[PDB]
Amino acid sequence: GRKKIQIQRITDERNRQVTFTKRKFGLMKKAYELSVLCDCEIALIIFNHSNKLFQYASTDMDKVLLKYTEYNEPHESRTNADIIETLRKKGF
Amino acid sequence: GRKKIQIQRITDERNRQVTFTKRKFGLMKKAYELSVLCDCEIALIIFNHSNKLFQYASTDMDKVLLKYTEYNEPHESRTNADIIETLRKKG
Amino acid sequence: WGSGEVKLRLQEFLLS
DNA sequence: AACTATTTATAAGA
DNA sequence: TCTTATAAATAGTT
Secondary structure: OOOOOOOOOOHHHHHHHHHHHHHHHHHHHHHHEEEEEEEEEEEEEHHHHOOEEEEEEEOOOOHHHHHHOOOOOOEEEEEHHHHHHHHHHHHO | OOOOOOOOOOOOOHHHHHHHHHHHHHHHHHHHHHHHHOOOOEEEEEEEEOOOOEEEEEOOOHHHHHHHHOOOOOOOOHHHHHHHHHHHHHO | OOOOOOOOOOOOHHHH
């Protein structure tokens, strides 16, 4: 971007909405690429700060949610804290 | 990257797994940033080619799924085909 | 995912 | 596992 | 909305 920003809450209502819209699309674009390159089925659910709902699924949201509910094994499961942990460990 | 690639299925099992791991993390990192910058709650569910499950949620997957079920109003809903269409338009 | 009451709530929403 | 040159994403401007 | 200067992610090689 024209200037580097720190990862922290945006206070200006207007900047927040603008950044939300652009980054949401950027997230969905990256999901699209992953699903095609690597043959994945992906669903994304986003609630904004007012709790409005936006959703993406590579093909069909219902099917992925149904598969999620059926899944029995333990699996990789991450939160913000896992991501932050990974970044403290990475050098790049 | 060193080269532009076409967005099409990677057949080399090894290249696929390397790409999968790096891009999955890239997706979760961008989710993390969006959730903090714009004060929102995000969940991501991924089934790989072997049907193994990977999941991310900014705070709590249960709560997002519970909230999802309670939503009834119409909302933005996109698929790969919408994204492809958008990219046609962007040029 | 495996078991639960959330699993139940999600399944029903999807099925109705 | 690493590095790095390049492609891609995006912050601030129009 | 676009655009473009810059920052961030990633392909290909090691």
